Amino acid sequence: AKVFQWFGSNESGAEFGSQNLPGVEGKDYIWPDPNTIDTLISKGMNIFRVPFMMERLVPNSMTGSPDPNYLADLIATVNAITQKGAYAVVDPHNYGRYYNSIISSPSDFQTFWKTVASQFASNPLVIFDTNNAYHDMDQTLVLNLNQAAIDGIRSAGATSQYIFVEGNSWTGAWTWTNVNDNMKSLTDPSDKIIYEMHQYLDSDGSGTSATCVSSTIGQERITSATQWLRANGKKGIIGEFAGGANDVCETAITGMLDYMAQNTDVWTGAIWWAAGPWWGDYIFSMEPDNGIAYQQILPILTPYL
Template sequence: MEGAPDTLPGHLNGEVFVTPVSHFAYYASVGMDHVRLEASWERMQPRINGELGEQLLDHYADANNPLRNTVALVKYYLDTAQKNNLRVILDLCHNYGERYVGYDGTWSKKSKAQLGSAQVPIAAFADYCAKIVKTFGSHPAVVGIELMNEPHDLAIGEGGWRTACQAAIDAIRKINTSITIVIDGYGWASAEFWPARNPTLHTLNDPSKKIIWSAHQYFDASSAGVYGGGSEKAPANANLGAQRIAPFVEWLSNHGFADRGHMGEFGAPDRDEWQPIVDNFLKAARAAGLRLTAHQDIAYPNDAYTMNLFPATNSAGVITGPDRRIVRLIKAK
């Protein structure tokens, strides 16, 4: 659901491309049981502390399409997921610790501000999380809310991220005591560097005891998932992925969260040379009891993105290609 985040509000079936129903059906058919639905804070709640869905998405030739309302679009995805027996993690703050501000009916004066600043106070973040849960949390497809994707390099630091998480937890639990709360680690949610970058995150208090800790990990030289645009060669160390997630697994065990871990993003180029690394990563993750969400589905047909999970299709949208290698490995486990 998320694309070109600097273009606001974005066009329906442009920057915000509606994922075809066939994608949901495909992932269910290969044995996946959930999806992670991404959207930006700005598109869901343009005005700080405002209402959800206040601004409609732009359009090309379909002004009356109800999915221009982002609340309606999320509900459409939830209904579609439910029909295909998929659960949904709401990642509706895919913002990395910052967002655009300055909406006054248009975005002509927009500027970016960090979480914890005067423009984006922690209380506003808690307000947004609570409104997301109030609006979508009771939908039967929803399995949890992810508070924020990959917070990093904030002026308020890891301690401020912990404070923001606690404020969001407190606000959510006033209206919903049962929804699972998914929390990314500070510092890009890196599994490899999780203990060093998150010295206080384990002290968060959820009275419902339903926190899931979500780490991300890639296997390229930078750990950023760039893979040289898909051209990077796989390293010789086939255990690299398993080794990179070991610090996160140890952190979970040390703090009594061994059954509460999640790999919220992982992926690799669709080439044979990467398969041993992915295979050993999957073995290690499953041995540690981690939940797994591969990255990522691309709604645009036959997109060349190096970690695209969806197979090739013809002009009618019918699948013509084989499963991607990473999907085959996931199915085999």
């Protein structure tokens, strides 16, 4: 059932092997497979988030020219998604950092975002994601970086697209109200800001263990974020979530999605972490046809597709 505006999967791989910059395609990183994206589209997903490294797209200086090969493959991936009618989220998977240093220049970040947005300005099914999971950095800077991204995107004439903004504390939903209240002041002339939060279900919320705290931990961890969105007249998306292929996690996943389904005045949907071609036996692999989550979790996501 078409419960949410957006329901889909991350398509990870282009950000793999980040210790090697620029690194080598086919050895350090790989782009998503359009054929397996088609399969997930056939299952009813309509949004695919595509991580990539800023340093690989725009080397040495974020204000510089794109790397032709890496950009060409980003373009190809985005077009493979949007040509089918689905939404493609362009996600610089960079944690608010560039060459492992916090991005402290909003002006530099705005130029980076004009450069990226210019490549996709006429495509209304592209979604721009300012940066993945800002963390351990100045709270006002996170606000200013998100605004600079919005400004750069709209300055390129990319005005039809939604913009996913992300907050501090790894943009966690469960930590949102404790640190990210200032994010309410972001402005967009297109009025298409979506607050992208992430929520994992293991004890520390890192999403590194297949064990979930309890059968209700997901719905508990997004309640205050839901109220924050409603109180501030904002819209949100869960841009990453996952749980292990086990009984407790299946119930936590459905409980949290069932809760968002009764709160769609603020929740636009949810995006699983993650599919992609190099996950192998990853505990959360949504990659068709043999990913653990593709085999064992996707059946419980049927009511939302």
